[PDB]
Every structure is written in structure tokens, then in C-alpha cells.
Motif scaffolding. Structure first.
Motif, short mmCIF file in Angstrom:
data_model
loop_
_atom_site.label_atom_id
_atom_site.label_comp_id
_atom_site.label_asym_id
_atom_site.label_seq_id
_atom_site.Cartn_x
_atom_site.Cartn_y
_atom_site.Cartn_z
N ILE A 35 66.06 26.07 81.65
CA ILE A 35 64.67 26.91 81.33
C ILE A 35 64.37 28.36 82.24
O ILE A 35 65.06 29.18 82.09
N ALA A 36 63.51 28.64 81.30
CA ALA A 36 63.06 30.11 80.87
C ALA A 36 61.70 30.63 81.53
O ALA A 36 60.59 29.80 81.21
N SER A 96 63.15 30.76 72.08
CA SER A 96 65.09 31.67 71.66
C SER A 96 64.77 32.72 73.23
O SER A 96 64.45 33.43 74.00
N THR A 97 66.18 32.87 73.79
CA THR A 97 67.03 33.30 75.16
C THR A 97 68.11 34.05 74.73
O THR A 97 69.32 33.03 73.61
N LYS A 98 68.85 34.98 74.62
CA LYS A 98 70.21 35.77 74.14
C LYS A 98 71.57 34.65 74.77
O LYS A 98 72.45 34.83 74.71
N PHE A 99 70.84 33.71 76.04
CA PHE A 99 71.61 32.52 76.38
C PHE A 99 71.41 31.33 75.19
O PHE A 99 72.36 30.37 76.03
N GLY A 100 70.44 31.17 74.57
CA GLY A 100 70.23 30.41 74.26
C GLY A 100 69.09 29.61 74.10
O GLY A 100 68.02 29.78 74.64
N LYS A 101 68.81 28.23 73.51
CA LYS A 101 67.25 28.20 73.47
C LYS A 101 66.80 27.54 74.39
O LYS A 101 67.51 26.83 75.89
N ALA A 102 65.23 27.90 75.03
CA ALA A 102 64.93 27.40 76.36
C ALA A 102 63.66 26.34 76.80
O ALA A 102 62.74 27.46 75.75
N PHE A 103 63.41 26.14 77.91
CA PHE A 103 62.71 25.62 77.81
C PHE A 103 61.40 26.21 78.77
O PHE A 103 61.78 27.18 79.85
N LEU A 104 59.81 26.95 78.17
CA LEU A 104 59.07 27.37 79.47
C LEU A 104 57.65 26.97 79.26
O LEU A 104 57.46 26.38 78.22
N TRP A 105 57.11 27.35 79.99
CA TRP A 105 55.48 26.58 80.82
C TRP A 105 54.93 27.62 79.77
O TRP A 105 54.48 28.63 80.87
N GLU A 106 53.86 27.22 79.01
CA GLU A 106 53.01 28.13 78.32
C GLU A 106 52.01 27.81 78.57
O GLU A 106 51.28 26.32 78.46
N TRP A 107 51.50 28.37 79.06
CA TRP A 107 49.76 28.35 79.65
C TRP A 107 48.87 27.50 78.60
O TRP A 107 48.81 28.19 78.32
#
Length: 118
Positions: free
Chosen positions: A4-5, A81-92
Motif C-alpha cells: 500500500i501507498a 506504480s511505485t519504485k517498489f512495485g504496484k501498490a494500492f492507494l485510497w483515492e478520495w
């Protein structure tokens, strides 16, 4: 294990960080294509700019607990996308509220605290 991000409430030192006390911190990164706003809660919405996030690896149980939190009502899960790989993010999921945080870093609010008390 879920990656997660987080850009706001779940970041270290923020109100809900205790949910990540057992998670593994991979490092911070910047997500392109997002803007950050803040009223009473932080909001990441798509737009011109970059967003500072802390990337973590959390187990399934931890992720499900977080994704059940009532305050998550107005946010929807997206992949980034992150430099550590794909991650989930909670978008408003609605129009953002509050002033825009130009730096794209939620810590800018702490800089304001610094300006007023130190």
C-alpha cells in the motif's frame, strides 16, 4: 501480503498510523498524477502534480481491517506504480475539500505548526 501507498492519515505519526505498527516500511516515494488537499481529512485526487507517499507491505488481515475503517467511506481503492512495485492507494472519491498542499507532502502541515510554535 498487500503493498500500500499512503499519503495522509495512515502515514507515520498521523492519526491512524497505529494500524500499521506491524507492517513493513519499504520507503517513501512520489506518485505522479495526483494532487493533495486538506480540510479535516487529507484527500488525494487525480490532477497535475506529484504526491508523497510512504509504501508498506501489510498482511491480508491488516489490509482488510484498514479497508473496513468507517473513515474510508469516501475513498476508493486504486492501484498506483511505485519504485517498489504496484501498490494500492485510497483515492478520495469526490471533489476535494480544503486548501491545496502544493508540495504534495502532508508534512507541510507540520511545517505550519513549526512556524506558529517554534
Amino acid at each position: 501480503s498487500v503493498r500500500i501507498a499512503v499519503y495522509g492519515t495512515l502515514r507515520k505519526g498521523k492519526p491512524l498510523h497505529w494500524y500499521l505498527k506491524g507492517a513493513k516500511f519499504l520507503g517513501e516515494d512520489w506518485i505522479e498524477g495526483y494532487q493533495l488537499y486538506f480540510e479535516y481529512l487529507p484527500y488525494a485526487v487525480k490532477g497535475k502534480g506529484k504526491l508523497k507517499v510512504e509504501v508498506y507491505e501489510v498482511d491480508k488481515e491488516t489490509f482488510e481491517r484498514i479497508n473496513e475503517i468507517e473513515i474510508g467511506t469516501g475513498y476508493r481503492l486504486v492501484e498506483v506504480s511505485t519504485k517498489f512495485g504496484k501498490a494500492f492507494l485510497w483515492e478520495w472519491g469526490s471533489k476535494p475539500r480544503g486548501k491545496r498542499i502544493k508540495s504534495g507532502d502532508f508534512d507541510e502541515i507540520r511545517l505550519e505548526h513549526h512556524h506558529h510554535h517554534h
